[PDB]
Amino acid sequence: SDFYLPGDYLLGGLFSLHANMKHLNFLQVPMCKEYEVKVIGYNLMQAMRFAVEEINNDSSLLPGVLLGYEIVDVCYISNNVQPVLYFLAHEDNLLPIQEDYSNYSSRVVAVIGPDNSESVMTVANFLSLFLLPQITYSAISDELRDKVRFPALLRTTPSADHHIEAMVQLMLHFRWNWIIVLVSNDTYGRDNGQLLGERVARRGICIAFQETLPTLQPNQNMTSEERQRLVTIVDKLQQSTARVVVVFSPDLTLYHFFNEVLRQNFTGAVWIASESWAIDPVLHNLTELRHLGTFLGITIQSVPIPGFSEFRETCNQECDNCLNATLSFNTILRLSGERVVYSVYSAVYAVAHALHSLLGCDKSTCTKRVVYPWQLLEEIWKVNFTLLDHQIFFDPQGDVALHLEIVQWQWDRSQNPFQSVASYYPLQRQLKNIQDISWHTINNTIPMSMCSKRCQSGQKKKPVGIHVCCFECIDCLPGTFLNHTEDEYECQACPNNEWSYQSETSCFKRQ
Amino acid sequence: LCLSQQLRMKGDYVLGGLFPLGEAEEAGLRSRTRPSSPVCTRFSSNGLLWALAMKMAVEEINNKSDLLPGLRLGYDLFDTCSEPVVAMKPSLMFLAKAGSRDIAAYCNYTQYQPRVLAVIGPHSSELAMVTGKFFSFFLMPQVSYGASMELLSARETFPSFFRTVPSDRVQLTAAAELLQEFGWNWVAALGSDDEYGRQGLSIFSALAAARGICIAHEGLVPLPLGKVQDVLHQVNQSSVQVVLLFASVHAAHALFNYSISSRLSPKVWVASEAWLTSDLVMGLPGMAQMGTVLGFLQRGAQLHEFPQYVKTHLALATDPAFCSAQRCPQCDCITLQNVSAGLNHHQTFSVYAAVYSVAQALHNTLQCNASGCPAQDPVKPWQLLENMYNLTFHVGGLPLRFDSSGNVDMEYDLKLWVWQGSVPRLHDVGRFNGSLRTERLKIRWHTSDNQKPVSRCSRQCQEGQVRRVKGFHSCCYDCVDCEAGSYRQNPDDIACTFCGQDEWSPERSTRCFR
Numbered sequence A: 001s002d003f004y005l006p007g008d009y010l011l012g013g014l015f016s017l018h019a020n021m022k023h024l025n026f027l028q029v030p031m032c033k034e035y036e037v038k039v040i041g042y043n044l045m046q047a048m049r050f051a052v053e054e055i056n057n058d059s060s061l062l063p064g065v066l067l068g069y070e071i072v073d074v075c076y077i078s079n080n081v082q083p084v085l086y087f088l089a090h091e092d093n094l095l096p097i098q099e100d101y102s103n104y105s106s107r108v109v110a111v112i113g114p115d116n117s118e119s120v121m122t123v124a125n126f127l128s129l130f131l132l133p134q135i136t137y138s139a140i141s142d143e144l145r146d147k148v149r150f151p152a153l154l155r156t157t158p159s160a161d162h163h164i165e166a167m168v169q170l171m172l173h174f175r176w177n178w179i180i181v182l183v184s185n186d187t188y189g190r191d192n193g194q195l196l197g198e199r200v201a202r203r204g205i206c207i208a209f210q211e212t213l214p215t216l217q218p219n220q221n222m223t224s225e226e227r228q229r230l231v232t233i234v235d236k237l238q239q240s241t242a243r244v245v246v247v248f249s250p251d252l253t254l255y256h257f258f259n260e261v262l263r264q265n266f267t268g269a270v271w272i273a274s275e276s277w278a279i280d281p282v283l284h285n286l287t288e289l290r291h292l293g294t295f296l297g298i299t300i301q302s303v304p305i306p307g308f309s310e311f312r313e314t315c316n317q318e319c320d321n322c323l324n325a326t327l328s329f330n331t332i333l334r335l336s337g338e339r340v341v342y343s344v345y346s347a348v349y350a351v352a353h354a355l356h357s358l359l360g361c362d363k364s365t366c367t368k369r370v371v372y373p374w375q376l377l378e379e380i381w382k383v384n385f386t387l388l389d390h391q392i393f394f395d396p397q398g399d400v401a402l403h404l405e406i407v408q409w410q411w412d413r414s415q416n417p418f419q420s421v422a423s424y425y426p427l428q429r430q431l432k433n434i435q436d437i438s439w440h441t442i443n444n445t446i447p448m449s450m451c452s453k454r455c456q457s458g459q460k461k462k463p464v465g466i467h468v469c470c471f472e473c474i475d476c477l478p479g480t481f482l483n484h485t486e487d488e489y490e491c492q493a494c495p496n497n498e499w500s501y502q503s504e505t506s507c508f509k510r511q
Numbered sequence B: 001l002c003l004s005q006q007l008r009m010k011g012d013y014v015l016g017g018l019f020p021l022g023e024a025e026e027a028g029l030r031s032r033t034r035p036s037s038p039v040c041t042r043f044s045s046n047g048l049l050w051a052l053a054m055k056m057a058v059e060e061i062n063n064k065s066d067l068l069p070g071l072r073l074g075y076d077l078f079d080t081c082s083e084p085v086v087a088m089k090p091s092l093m094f095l096a097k098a099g100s101r102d103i104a105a106y107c108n109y110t111q112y113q114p115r116v117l118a119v120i121g122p123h124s125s126e127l128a129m130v131t132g133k134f135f136s137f138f139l140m141p142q143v144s145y146g147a148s149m150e151l152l153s154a155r156e157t158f159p160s161f162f163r164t165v166p167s168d169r170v171q172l173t174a175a176a177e178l179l180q181e182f183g184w185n186w187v188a189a190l191g192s193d194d195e196y197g198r199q200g201l202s203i204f205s206a207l208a209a210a211r212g213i214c215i216a217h218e219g220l221v222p223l224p225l226g227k228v229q230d231v232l233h234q235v236n237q238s239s240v241q242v243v244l245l246f247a248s249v250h251a252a253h254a255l256f257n258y259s260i261s262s263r264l265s266p267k268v269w270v271a272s273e274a275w276l277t278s279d280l281v282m283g284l285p286g287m288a289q290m291g292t293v294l295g296f297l298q299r300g301a302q303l304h305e306f307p308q309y310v311k312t313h314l315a316l317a318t319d320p321a322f323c324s325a326q327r328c329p330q331c332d333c334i335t336l337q338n339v340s341a342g343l344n345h346h347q348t349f350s351v352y353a354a355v356y357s358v359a360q361a362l363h364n365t366l367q368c369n370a371s372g373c374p375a376q377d378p379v380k381p382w383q384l385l386e387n388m389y390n391l392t393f394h395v396g397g398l399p400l401r402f403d404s405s406g407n408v409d410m411e412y413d414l415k416l417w418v419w420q421g422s423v424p425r426l427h428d429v430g431r432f433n434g435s436l437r438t439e440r441l442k443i444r445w446h447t448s449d450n451q452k453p454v455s456r457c458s459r460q461c462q463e464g465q466v467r468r469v470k471g472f473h474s475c476c477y478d479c480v481d482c483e484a485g486s487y488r489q490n491p492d493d494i495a496c497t498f499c500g501q502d503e504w505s506p507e508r509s510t511r512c513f514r
């Protein structure tokens, strides 16, 4: 079927086709068709398939070596472990234990790893024993930079630190000094929230309010506690002065949050999406959001893959509903440029070139041999070449220096529904080349959020304690003056021979 | 001596054992060029102490006349050098097919058979998590000692996990009850910037919100540094007398080193179990005036026979005649003093209880009559799983009880540091067994007034006082008055407002009159 292709070397593929948040059952392995299918996961799986097919067709590098692939669905945290054993096992599906594996050839030569950080780490804790190379797309968590703990892991995506840096620089560019943070009830929410807290403290931003969302099943019938929880959240959002909101959440759990706020009618906010939902077609299909405010999100650069659209048109290998689910959203995904598809494509090409150089292959003419995965891991570090106008090579931490975009949502489907407003360069750690942005304001004036208005002339600062961003102002009394040039917080006393004009910056003579 | 050869013993059913027998050198986390693992050449006492406890438990259970009659119970121990890669190989071997070299990648396991019936799990929570995913997919019953993280309690991630120590949440709920009963409504909380302190601070914040007690801010402190000063500045500026330091011992030691180096204000410190033992921290001379230290420890009967058992069995290991009857090449070098240095460690009791619990669970699963068990198709783990979930088992005396949470029930003692000289000494000041039975009269407060230091905030105001809040999630009022004549045009609003010179009004007014 579509999920397997024989060859001289096999790539193990792990993709999250069905990913409902809600072990063996009756001592048999789970099967994920009972959960809702994800469009993006199937798209990325097809992206890997296209990449390997092109490598097979491409006569420029390999000497007719057939690069095969075998894809198993890592349904988020579930359905795990078993795929790793199925990859590691020998040709008889049994795995003999040894004191030293350096003489052992696995059934797959490399693994295109999971996307969920939890699955990535679970698989890596297995493969670290074998040093079987693992390349994971889109798994941003900065845990994976602890290389001594994860030697065999590499990534075709920038880390979470760059994402939070891009958010901070975006806020500073428009002087949004006063923001709200929402997190899901899991590691993705918590770790990113703490990272954002540290980044915020250093740079002159203040988190006005922070709260955990309930993890509703996307077709849940609401419990009383959940309903009151969501309305409490929207109440807190309404009371605070900031209209700038940061949301760290999976896509599924935000559907009913949006449905709820679309009945509270608390419109006019600036929504900053984390990359987990910045480009979600399903959420963006809700035309109501056109009337809920302005939506911005951070995501990887769009790189146009040639011919990808035309190509697109032993447990639990198969899917059926994936095709039907793709048929309709092909309308969006043809206009939408290949974004993460490039991460998958570049992972496949990186492994292809690493294999080609490991075999020391001259043009389409070299020998075929058994390859132990540790040698291929050793060679994967060392690739350096342009794939589609972007050079791909790994930092000492294992990340690839791909550019990031900030995308503004568009509802005029005659154009690309996601519009690029800025570009971020990770080597420079700078946001750059900001474009025109269509705000919700009556004259397209930049929306505003600060704790307090700037003081008038001749006033000293009066902090109200809870945040450094919040300060009232005090007029200087006679006999004192505002020496903002040297000190902002206290009106300096005038020389003994002179006086002051109340709220003024300088003294004068009196009798 | 011959001691490594004793680490395995055949039986009709066999229990796998994981213990931290060795520890890595500074560079022992080597950047391996090739897959094979390191070996931690440095011996450590605690691993051998716990392994001896397990061996004693198994030998007693074999000698027992009514438990498992006619059934011979074996053990199979392995080292875990606190690092996942070292741990994976022995766990893989545990899950290998019976009597064979290999583990099978089947799609269903209705007829599979691992070579061990149960696994005595690793000590630290990191290994607990990593090995728990693997083991619990296979539905292998894993009983762990010392793994305290509440994260492990989730049955939708760890179906087959059990432990013989209280989960962190019991400690933190006892702490919340302590704060509630002493009336400390306004507090500061600190976690060590590792998974332990991070998760504990998350749990405590959730409980504090659930009980109305107010967090000043969620601070986290570095492990071994330059940000601890900022955290201490925040605590100083926040005007708090009660600080919950839930931290690993190294981080607490660093924090207190800096605190005494900074002449920090004396404050009430509430301590986690680990830091309170304070082998490191109790040495600093200025500790006697750093404030008040309160904390909890859980109470269980001491494994009194253990020291004599160790002396007996190491004497036997000294006798070359018994040696006539290898996975720890470090062990055979060890002289008895290395073990004597820690011949009273209390978690030996937890190891003993875990072994006894598994033995009792197997006895129940066989439906065995004490006069003799029936001939049976050999038992398999998922049969033990369904029986263990509601089991009661004795440990000497002290009947313990599992429940669906995976914890054993427990009770705690509230302890206080009394000072004589530069040495603090632990004394009991109350009981907790789900509610706090405080013995208030015994407390000595750090203030010379020796009456309880206050740390509180209000949730009430006089009508005219401005609506204003503080705390990490607005958990406190801080309303304040306004001067006479001037009036707050809306008491639900901030701006006090003014009128002509020939007009007057009271204090805290919301109106003005000519």
Ligand SMILES: COC(=O)[C@H](Cc1ccccc1)NC(=O)[C@H](CC(=O)O)NCCCc1ccc(OC)c(O)c1
Binding pocket: A016, A017, A019, A038, A040, A041, A076, A115, A116, A117, A118, A138, A139, A140, A141, A188, A250, A251, A275, A276, A277, A340
């Ligand atoms: C961790 O929290 C999460 O569950 C979320 C969302 C999620 C839910 C179910 C299964 C996978 C992911 N994870 C992420 O966003 C990870 C970062 C990390 O996981 O470290 N970046 C993936 C970006 C492209 C993407 C690929 C596959 C998608 O569907 C299968 C999808 O929706 C989005």
